[PDB]
Design a protein around this ligand. Structure first.
Ligand code: Z6I
Lengths: 179, 245
């Protein structure tokens, strides 16, 4: 088994801590959802190759521009997250997060991940967003942003229902294994 | 970690740690507050444990088994004794607050009603000055520590055998040298997230809400101060590179 490093970036409420928790426990916690994620080394086998994938979070580091880049050394794959219930989180992807990740992680593949895909068909989400002349992020809007920023690929998932979670991490492992 | 503390923090939550007959005696809001307080202490216990792996397993093991040049072990593990002293003292206070609150005849049933004052004390005065000084120094030597580690693992056979040997057990899966350094760096930015969620469930007593609001403010002041005192040290950097920053 080869060792690879994954770091997830994105705005404070993009759901990146919940995504790492649900993958690492292989379950959406029934009793208590942790506030924070320390780290984890997942055993993953993708396309016949065994990899130990170390998982890291940047939650808490969003307002600290000198502490945050300390998470980036030797990263093999980046998961750049946004929340599908928050079109404002997608707007900050090319403005702030993309120039940062391209500077500290040159040539590292980036996967743009649309989180909370379950809220696209949530009536409370739809009513709330319509009060700010908005709607949940459309699948094509996510694909077009990933295409624009030079992402390796675009994926969607729901940490709440577990749908798409496993696929994101197996694909991240494949991206980390490339050239 | 010592067995007593591991068992006390073995459950995924406070609600699963206490007896179900004790849990039934509390309101939902108190259970939600206690779950986040337990998470802060359980994560502090693991953080102190990361610092013990760095001092006792790695640092001390290199001094007693390997022949490294003077100042090499200090460059790999900067400020580890200082960090261990800050967090072991903070952990002793959190664990004593839990113990004092235990019901007579119980080693697991407790409720912590007054965490705010302990957090204001930790993130103010001399102990806050020491946290600021130590993390400003540690985080500025983080990249130099990583580059020094990689050089040693790649060029020294005895160093590579030492690492592979002490990191072989499964309990050390998440705690390699580089992983311990990033765990320590990320610890300080975990504090506002935990404190804000404790605050969200601490409106019952106006005094407690005020103390947690003050402590959250002090933690943010500390983080802003540490963030501004960081400049990555580079081995072999020339003065011209430094003053042209
Ligand atoms: C240099 C730096 N520190 N924190 C963030 C940054 C970015 C990197 C990408 N370009 C703008 C500054």
């Amino acid at each position: 088994a080869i060792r690879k490093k994954l770091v997830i970036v994105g705005d404070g409420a993009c759901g990146k801590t919940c995504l790492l928790i649900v993958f690492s426990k292989d379950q959406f916690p029934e009793v208590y959802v942790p506030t924070v994620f320390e780290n984890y080394v997942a055993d993953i086998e993708v396309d016949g190759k065994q990899v130990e994938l170390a998982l890291w979070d940047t939650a808490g580091q969003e307002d600290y521009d000198r502490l945050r880049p300390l998470s980036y050394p030797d990263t093999d794959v980046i998961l750049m997250c946004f929340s599908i219930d928050s079109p404002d989180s997608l707007e900050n992807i090319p403005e702030k997060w993309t120039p940062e990740v391209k500077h500290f992680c040159p040539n590292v593949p980036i996967i743009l991940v649309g989180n909370k895909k379950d809220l696209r068909n949530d009536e409370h989400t739809r009513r709330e967003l319509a009060k700010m002349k908005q709607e949940p992020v459309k699948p094509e809007e996510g694909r077009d942003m990933a295409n624009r920023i030079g992402a390796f690929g675009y994926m969607e998932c729901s940490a709440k229902t577990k749908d798409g979670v496993r696929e994101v991490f197996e694909m991240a492992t494949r991206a980390a294994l490339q050239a | 970690s010592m067995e007593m503390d591991e068992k006390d923090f073995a459950a995924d939550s406070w609600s699963l740690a206490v007896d179900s007959s004790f849990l039934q005696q509390h309101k939902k809001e108190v259970m939600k507050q206690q779950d986040v307080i337990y998470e802060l202490i359980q994560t502090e216990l693991h953080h102190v444990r990361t610092l013990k792996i760095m001092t006792r397993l790695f640092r001390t093991g290199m001094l007693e088994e390997l022949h490294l040049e003077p100042g090499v072990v200090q460059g790999l593990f900067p400020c580890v004794d200082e960090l261990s002293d800050i967090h072991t003292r903070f952990l002793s206070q959190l664990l004593e607050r839990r113990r004092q609150a235990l019901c007579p005849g119980s080693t697991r049933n407790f409720v912590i009603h007054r965490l705010g004052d302990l957090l204001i004390s930790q993130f103010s005065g001399p102990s806050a000055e020491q946290m600021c000084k130590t993390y400003s120094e540690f985080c500025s030597r983080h990249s130099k520590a990583l580059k020094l580690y990689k050089e040693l693992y790649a060029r020294d056979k005895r160093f590579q055998q030492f690492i592979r040997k002490v990191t072989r057990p499964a309990v050390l899966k998440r705690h390699g040298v580089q992983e311990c350094i990033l765990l320590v760096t990320q610890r300080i930015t975990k504090y506002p997230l935990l404190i804000s969620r404790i605050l969200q469930h601490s409106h019952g007593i106006e005094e407690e809400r005020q103390d947690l609001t003050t402590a959250l403010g002090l933690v943010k002041e500390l983080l802003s101060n540490v963030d501004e005192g960081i400049y990555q040290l580079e081995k072999g950097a020339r003065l011209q590179e430094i003053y042209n920053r």
